[PDB]
Structure formats: structure tokens, C-alpha cells
Design a protein around this motif. Structure first.
Motif, PDB file in Angstrom:
ATOM      1  N   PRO A 109       0.836  -1.213   0.000  1.00 27.26           N
ATOM      2  CA  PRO A 109       0.000   0.000   0.000  1.00 27.26           C
ATOM      3  C   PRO A 109       0.858   1.245   0.000  1.00 27.26           C
ATOM      4  CG  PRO A 109      -0.884  -1.546   1.513  1.00 27.26           C
ATOM      5  CD  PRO A 109       0.432  -2.125   1.082  1.00 27.26           C
ATOM      6  N   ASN A 111      -0.426   3.966   0.871  1.00 29.95           N
ATOM      7  CA  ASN A 111      -0.968   4.641   2.056  1.00 29.95           C
ATOM      8  C   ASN A 111      -1.751   3.711   2.961  1.00 29.95           C
ATOM      9  OD1 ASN A 111      -2.098   6.349   4.009  1.00 29.95           O
ATOM     10  ND2 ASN A 111      -2.406   8.041   2.571  1.00 29.95           N
ATOM     11  N   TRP A 112      -1.216   3.501   4.161  1.00 26.66           N
ATOM     12  CA  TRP A 112      -1.800   2.558   5.103  1.00 26.66           C
ATOM     13  C   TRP A 112      -2.815   3.250   6.000  1.00 26.66           C
ATOM     14  CZ3 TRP A 112      -1.811  -2.556   5.337  1.00 26.66           C
ATOM     15  CH2 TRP A 112      -0.764  -3.288   4.740  1.00 26.66           C
ATOM     16  N   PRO A 166      -6.796   0.138   2.615  1.00 30.65           N
ATOM     17  CA  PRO A 166      -5.442   0.537   2.236  1.00 30.65           C
ATOM     18  C   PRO A 166      -4.863  -0.345   1.144  1.00 30.65           C
ATOM     19  CG  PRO A 166      -5.481  -0.515   4.409  1.00 30.65           C
ATOM     20  CD  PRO A 166      -6.903  -0.196   4.043  1.00 30.65           C
ATOM     21  N   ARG A 192      -8.883  -5.713   4.032  1.00 30.36           N
ATOM     22  CA  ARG A 192      -7.856  -4.732   3.749  1.00 30.36           C
ATOM     23  C   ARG A 192      -8.214  -3.862   2.563  1.00 30.36           C
ATOM     24  NH1 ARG A 192      -5.300  -9.435   5.185  1.00 30.36           N
ATOM     25  NH2 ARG A 192      -3.844  -9.260   6.961  1.00 30.36           N
TER      26      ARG A 192
END
Ligand SMILES: CC(=O)N[C@@H]1[C@@H](O)[C@H](O)[C@@H](CO)O[C@@H]1O
Ligand SMILES: CC(=O)N[C@@H]1[C@@H](O)[C@H](O)[C@@H](CO)O[C@@H]1O
Ligand SMILES: [Ca+2]
Ligand SMILES: [Ca+2]
Ligand SMILES: [Zn+2]
Ligand SMILES: [Zn+2]
Lengths: 403, 403
Positions: free
Chosen positions: A206, A208-209, A214, A275
Motif C-alpha cells: 500500500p 498509504n496505510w 489501504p 484490507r
């Protein structure tokens, strides 16, 4: 070929692994899967009812299976390991905290991994692409045990107190955490069982977590290929971010790492689930990446070949490395390989360059090496090629017992 | 030349009694092979075993060979649920030889668990070249052999589904073995596919009388036991030995690798002053004396790592002769003298691989009717041939027939 990409998938076998493999097969490439068998036991806190199916599929499709430990070290994330431990550690998010504690127990997890794989798939050893007992990779850790002179550790991979992003987090590679120290000992224990371990050059993760879903922000194929281009011949294990992914003392320019990029990623990033919409969004990234990488002149290989197989007819230069029957050798003298002159424990043409520390035959030992032998540690005082008669307990001109 | 070679093999250690056994062997100037069960190190093996680790260390430091006898001696198949008391529970019933093998995958797994436990309690154990835990094994209860591709045979009445050999109404049918035996046969094959050799025995140094309160006291005296050894030398003992559960019915009598060699089975625990009798006081002298008189008679003592003779440069080999090299069994293609650079291997023209395994393997001389495993499938060798890399069974539908 402008380079060789090694697609390496960690933390399977899970449901998500199935479509990943099909994308690989459609793309005409083989990858390496570093598996945690606890998913086969249904305790890994993933969608994993198709774990065995995924394992068989990986193997029937020709992909390489390697050893990521039985439980991804989740036994060190919780007080008492059990069937809910994956969910507990996922609840706390303490995976990278005290990840390694007792290195003997932690290394034993890799052997437990063989037990479980061979439990669920009793035929697994009949697959030449099963490399669970030869190739491994440590949880959380960009650490390497490739050859006697190609080894390095992830000096801030795991922590004793605070997760990396947090304020005041300190990472001193010179005085690493206890977890990192323990993980180094695990590396050594595995190398003495004949494993190679491999880290990675780039992590397909990712971008951006912090956003919802994400996994959706997995790097798009084009920019990912840019990352790969950037890692090629650029010692990216030292420059990679985040910090806990670095291999600070990685031997930049080491010959076996040339023209190769190891991609780490995770099967679970390719499912539609907790996720994000990883199948929908990321399977086409994987497919496109393979296509455009090939277009750009890359070829794809597997980690059993990362150290190239000894090949009859090929000419070798002194100092060049091969893998023969799971053991790393370094050519002593330049020559052309012929049938009867394979590397071995007595060959004059090759020495054993496994990344191990137990005293072994036909190893070119260097001054300052410390070797283990019959339960003692010995300092090598003069460089020499080990042979059966020159055992450390009997050659005080070569070895000095340490206290 | 010597009258023959004796291989002293001690089963069921490491225990307290092991220490004095080791000392006598040491005073006798001989090396033996100990097939160990690591559950004693955990103190759950129901023996005097607080010195187990001391014994293991002493065995290895003294140069004796350590082999794999499985973690718990299959006691998990003697009880409803395996635990810290299962050794005592099984000693209470005396059902060790009943249902001894059930799930072969699980039972074979005990041999790997044994490796884990040994490497937990003595983390330096892999630095001992005399540690052969991962190479040499012997099945509990079972006079079974996986030596070479043409030297293998099972204990067809070693274990039972119901009655014990001495209970009336007990029936041994080799042609139609018990389930436990069939399972043990699979365990042999599993271990052989993991690279183990397994060996049975030719003579068993045991109580002459199990019906007295101190049976260890009736261990055969040195002189008459030597007479048994003499009788065993070159006479296919595994077929004639008693009791019936100790037989290897289809042992390849006269097989060259077995010539002039006598394997002796015994147990460390028979050399203890304790619940089986005055083993130390009475049997340590018998052991010492037997060593002395065997030597005087022209016998030499050796270890099981050398039973298949190690390849050695300079030695002349004849077509069809077997050697061990780096834990792998090989068979000479033609008569020749061994040279440093021409060692047995997967690519050698001088040697074929002759491990007693069934997984398809490179450079193996396959016979018609051989059945090999390859990528999860079974194949009949229709055309005998020497395997090579391009003749994998999935692509050679003339050489092999899928089953
Ligand atoms: C953020 C994230 O998905 N972390 C995962 C964790 O869920 C998983 O249990 C562990 C073992 O596979 O790997 C990663 O740390
Ligand atoms: C009669 C006798 O001593 N039997 C022993 C048993 O006690 C022991 O627990 C087992 C495993 O070590 O080996 C033998 O079967
Ligand atoms: Ca290896
Ligand atoms: Ca072997
Ligand atoms: Zn992982
Ligand atoms: Zn036994």
C-alpha cells in the motif's frame, strides 16, 4: 534481458493466493511463495479455507515454495500461543514488537513449518519446486544468508518497545534491539541447517496505510515498474523505506545481486476483503506489471535460481557462485563445467560457500572467521581450505578455541 | 583383515544409564550408534533421565553417532491423548507394540519433532559431525531397512493390531500384515523420501529371560553373546532371529552390503540399576568383556554412518558397489579408482543415485515395475532407464505410465 525479477509472495497459503497464482500462470511466469503453514491449520486469521487448494495449485503450477516459519512468529506477539493468537496480534498490531525472543524456539518454527506442510500435503516432497527445507525468509526481516560472503541482517526490523512510525522511536543498527539480535541468531541457526534466507529489494505494498481499504493503494503497475527500474543494480536494501525494511550492512555490488530485483509482496493484498478490494484493484496491477516488465526486457525467475544452478558446459570464472544440490559453491579456478566435475566436498575446482558457521569440509576459511565444532567455538587463525584431517579440535595452527 | 565388523547400536536413550554405557564404550576403545528418543530430555519418558542432556552431550563429545529413533518412540499411539504422563501410562499397559503406528504421516513427523527437541536442548548439536539425527533412523519396534534402492525390507510382524506375540491366538501373516505394520512401511517410505536411511539389526542383546523380576540381570553373558554374533556373521539373521516381531522376512540374504557385518541392537536402559534389574552392576561388565573378546576374536567395531561405506578417494570400486557420500547412497557404474574431482553426484557418469527412496530423482537407475512419485502423482516405470532432467515422468509417457 535487462534484468531478472524475482516475484516473491509472503504469508500464504490463503484464499487470496489462488487468483494470484492464476494471474501468474496467465502471465507465463513462475514466482516464489514464502509460506506460513498455520493457515493450513485455519488459525492464521485470514480467509484460508482454500489454503491447501492454494498450496497444491502453487506447486502444480510450478511455483517455488519456501519457508516463512509456521506462525510468522505470532507466538512472540502473545502471552500463550493458540488458535486465536493471529487475531489477538492483529487486534494489538504488535507484530513487529518483540517479534524474536528465544532464537532456538523461533528457528524451530521453520522446522515446524515443514512438519505441517508435509502433514497437509504428504506428497509435497515429490515436487522439485518444493523448497521448504532449502529456502527461507524471516518474518518482518530483510535479512540474507546467501553465501559465505553475501549475508546481512535487518538491523532495525523488529523492536523491543515502540513501532517505527511513532515519535521518539530510535533505531541504532550498532546497538540493535534484543528482537533483532535474536533474529540474527535465528538466521544463523537456519543457515546451519542448510537454508539460504533472502530479503527483498522492493516491497509491493500500500502506498498509504492510513486510508480506508489501504490495499487499494497498492502501487500501480507502471510506477511499480519504475520502482523496480530504480532498484536494479542500486543496492536498494540500504535505501529502501521504511527503516525496519532496511538491510543496513547489505554488501552493495555483491556479484550475485547484480541485475536482479527481488520483489516482496503479500498474497493477502490481492483479495477483496478486510484490507480492501485487493482482487478487483490489484490482480490487474499484477497482470499488467508482468506484461510491461517483459515488454521492457525483464525476465522473471524464482529463488531456487537466484544463485544459479551449476550447468554442464558453462564456463565459470574463479570466484563465481553456483548452487548444486542445495549447497552454494564458489569456483576455485576458472574452467568449463563437465559432467563428472560437479562441485562437491572434495572438488578441487570449487569450495563450499554456504552462509553457515558450523565447520564444514572444503570451505575456504578466512582469518577471523569463527566456526562451531563439536559444541565449541573456534577462531580461524590462518586462511585455509578445510579438509577432513584438519578438524578444529586437532589443528591449533589453524584454529584457536574461544572461551 | 578382520573377522567382521560389529555395529553396536543402543536404542531408547538418552537416559541416566547412558552415561556409564558411554564410559565403558570409551574405556573399550570403541564407537557406537545411539538411536535416541528426545522425550527423555523433556523428562516425560518415564525413565531415570535427569541426566539425559548430560548423556547426549557425553555421547556426542565422546564421538559416538547419534541417530533418530523418533521423539516419543510412538507412545502417542499407545494412549488416547499424548502428554507428560503417556510414557508411564503406556508402561502401565505394556501396549507399546500394539497399534504402534496408525497415521504414518504423523508417526513420520515424530522423527522431525525429534530433531527439533534435540536441537532445542543442545543448540550446538549440528556442529557435531557425529550427529546424524537427520540422516540415520530406526523405527521403534521394527526390524526394518531402507539402506539402498536394492537393500530394503520390512519387519512384517513387528507391530500388531490386537494381540502381542506371546498372547495365545496371536497370528503373524507376513503376506497380509497388520495395519500397524502397513503404516510402519509407509513411515519407512516417508523417512526415506526425506533422505533417511533406516537400519534394523542382526542380533539383539536382551534379557535371556523376561519372566524374572529383574530381567536385565539375564542379559546374555559376553562369551555366549559373542557366539550369537559369530552365528549371525554372513547367515541372514534378520530372517531367522527370534522373536517373530524382530524378523525381517524379506531381508535380501547375501546382499553384498550386509556381508561380514553384524548389527547389534541393545538398549541403554538394560545397563541401569533400577526397575529392570541390576543392569549397571551386572551388565556394564558384560559389555566391557564383550568388547575385549570380540576384538581378540578379530572383530572390529564401527558405526552406522559407515555401514554403507563412505566414498574415499584413492579406493577402487567395482561395478555395482555402493557408497555413501554426503549422506546420499550411490552405486558404481563401472570399475574404477576414485579421484578427488570425480565424486558421486546427481550428474556423475561413474555413479548413480541409489537412495532407498521412491520420489523421482535424478541419476537413478530405475527398474521395470518401479513406482516413483512426481509432483503429487505416481508413475510406473515401464521402460527401465537411468533418470535424467529432461525425462521427468510427467513428460515421458513412454518411459513412465501414470497410475
Ligand atoms: C497490516 C497487516 O495486514 N499486517 C499483517 C498481519 O495482519 C498478519 O497477521 C501478519 C502475518 O501474516 O503479517 C502482517 O504483519
Ligand atoms: C519392557 C520395556 O522395558 N519396554 C520399553 C518401554 O518401557 C519403553 O517406554 C519403550 C520406549 O523407550 O521401550 C521399550 O518398549
Ligand atoms: Ca542449502
Ligand atoms: Ca540420506
Ligand atoms: Zn511475512
Ligand atoms: Zn526403541
Amino acid at each position: 534481458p535487462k534484468g531478472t525479477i524475482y516475484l516473491t509472495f509472503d504469508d500464504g497459503p490463503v484464499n487470496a493466493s489462488v487468483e494470484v497464482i492464476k494471474v501468474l500462470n496467465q502471465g507465463g511466469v513462475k514466482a516464489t511463495f514464502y509460506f506460513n503453514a498455520w493457515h493450513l491449520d485455519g488459525i492464521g486469521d485470514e480467509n484460508e479455507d482454500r489454503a491447501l487448494e492454494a498450496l497444491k495449485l502453487a506447486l502444480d503450477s510450478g511455483h517455488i515454495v519456501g519457508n516463512h516459519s509456521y506462525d510468522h512468529m505470532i507466538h512472540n506477539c502473545v502471552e500463550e500461543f493458540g488458535p486465536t493468537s493471529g487475531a489477538d496480534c492483529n487486534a494489538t498490531g504488535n507484530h513487529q514488537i518483540h517479534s524474536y525472543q528465544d532464537p532456538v524456539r523461533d528457528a524451530a518454527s521453520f522446522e515446524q513449518n515443514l512438519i505441517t506442510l508435509e502433514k497437509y500435503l504428504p506428497t509435497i516432497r515429490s515436487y522439485p519446486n518444493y523448497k521448504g527445507y532449502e529456502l527461507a525468509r524471516l518474518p518482518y526481516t530483510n535479512g540474507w544468508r546467501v553465501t559465505k560472503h553475501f549475508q546481512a541482517d535487518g538491523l532495525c526490523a523488529t523492536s523491543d518497545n515502540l513501532k517505527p512510525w511513532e515519535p521518539g522511536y530510535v533505531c541504532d543498527p550498532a546497538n540493535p534491539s534484543n528482537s533483532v539480535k535474536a533474529s540474527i541468531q535465528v538466521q544463523n541457526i537456519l543457515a546451519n541447517q542448510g537454508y539460504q534466507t533472502h530479503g527483498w529489494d522492493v516491497d509491493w505494498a500500500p502506498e498509504n496505510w492510513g486510508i480506508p481499504m489501504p490495499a487499494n493503494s497498492l502501487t500501480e503497475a507502471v510506477p511499480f515498474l519504475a520502482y523496480v527500474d530504480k532498484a536494479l543494480n542500486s543496492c536498494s536494501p540500504t535505501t529502501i523505506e521504511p527503516i525496519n525494511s532496511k538491510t543496513q550492512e547489505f554488501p552493495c555490488g555483491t556479484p550475485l545481486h547484480a541485475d536482479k530485483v527481488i520483489v516482496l509482496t503479500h498474497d493477502f493484498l490481492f483479495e477483496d476483503g478486510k484490507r480492501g478490494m485487493g482482487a478487483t484493484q490489484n490482480l490487474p496491477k499484477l497482470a499488467e506489471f508482468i506484461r510491461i516488465a517483459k515488454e521492457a526486457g525483464y525476465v522473471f525467475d524464482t529463488m531456487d535460481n537466484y544463485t544459479p544452478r551449476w550447468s554442464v558446459g558453462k564456463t565459470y570464472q574463479a570466484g563465481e557462485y553456483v548452487l548444486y544440490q542445495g549447497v552454494v559453491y564458489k569456483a576455485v579456478i576458472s574452467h568449463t563445467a563437465q559432467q563428472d566435475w560437479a562441485p562437491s566436498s572434495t572438488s578441487s575446482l570449487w569450495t563450499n560457500a554456504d552462509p553457515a558457521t558450523n565447520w564444514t569440509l572444503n570451505v575456504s576459511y578466512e582469518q577471523g572467521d569463527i566456526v562451531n565444532y563439536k559444541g565449541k567455538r573456534y577462531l580461524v587463525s590462518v586462511p585455509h581450505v578445510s579438509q577432513q584431517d584438519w578438524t578444529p579440535d586437532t589443528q591449533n595452527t589453524l584454529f584457536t578455541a574461544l572461551e
